[PDB]
Structure 1
Amino acid sequence: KVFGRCELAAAMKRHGLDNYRGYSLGNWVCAAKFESNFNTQATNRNTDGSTDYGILQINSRWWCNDGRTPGSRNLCNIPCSALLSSDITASVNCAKKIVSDGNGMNAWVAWRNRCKGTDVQAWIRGCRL
């Protein structure tokens, strides 16, 4: 599923991601745009052989099982395919664990380089939320 901006904002808010760990909703929407272009089915292979999955490009090295990242962990206790569903619940629940792990949203490279320090409220501007 390719979400619209306000559609994704509403879903993230409903699932409690807004202000989670102090990160306002626009941070999460901005991260999703640059990680996945709002596409739940996005997948991208990393240099080390892990893969990133879903709207927030969550990494099989630590967070989900894809059966092809030998030696990796599955700290969200999910198949990585659960992160590709039209329903973002699993991605949100796993993102909450990631952003709580000490590094905050710096875990998302596209967020650090393209969202951090910007006017992120622009990403939710105009939406009814």
Structure 2
Amino acid sequence: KVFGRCELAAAMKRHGLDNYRGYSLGNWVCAAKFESNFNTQATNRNTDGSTDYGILQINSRWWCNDGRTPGSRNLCNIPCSALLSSDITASVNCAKKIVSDGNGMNAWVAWRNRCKGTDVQAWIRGCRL
């Protein structure tokens, strides 16, 4: 599923992402725009053999199990394909764990380089939230 901008924002707000760990909803929508272009089915292989899955591009080295990243952890206790569903519940719950890890939203490279320090509020402007 390829979410709309205000469609996603409403979904993440309902799943408890507005101001989760102090990151306003605009940070999450901006991060999803640039990590996956709002596409739940996005995947990307990295040089280290790991793969990023889903609308927030969660990595297989420590967070989900895809059965092909040797020596990896599964801290969100889910198969990576569960991160690919049109229901973002799995992606949101796992991201809550990632954003609490200590480095915050800097664990997403696209957020750090394309959303951090910007007017992220423009990403929810005009949305009926």
Q: Deviation string for 1:55-112 (max 9, x for gaps)?
A: 0000000000000000000000000000000000000000000000000000000000
Name structure 1 gaps, 5 residues minimum.
none
Give the match for residue 65 of structure 2.
65
Aligned residue pair count: 129
Asked if 1:75 is matched to 2:75, the reply is: yes
Taking the TM superposition and a 5 Å limit, the aligned residue runs for 1:1-129 are: 1-129=1-129
Secondary structure, aligned partner of 1:71: coil
Percentage identity across paired residues of the two chains: 100
Secondary structure, aligned partner of 2:128: coil
Secondary structure, aligned partner of 1:44: strand
Whole-Å separation in 2 of the counterparts to 1:2 and 1:17: 19
**How far 1:114 moved relative to its partner?**
0.2
Secondary structure, aligned partner of 2:52: strand
Secondary structure, aligned partner of 1:13: helix
Whole-Å separation in 1 of the counterparts to 2:54 and 2:18: 18
Secondary structure, aligned partner of 1:52: strand
**How far 1:29 moved relative to its partner?**
0.1
CA RMSD, Structure 1 to Structure 2 (Å):
0.3
Tell me the TM-score normalised to structure 1 length.
1.00
Whole-Å separation in 2 of the counterparts to 1:74 and 1:125: 36
Provide runs of 4+ in structure 1 moved above 6 Å: none
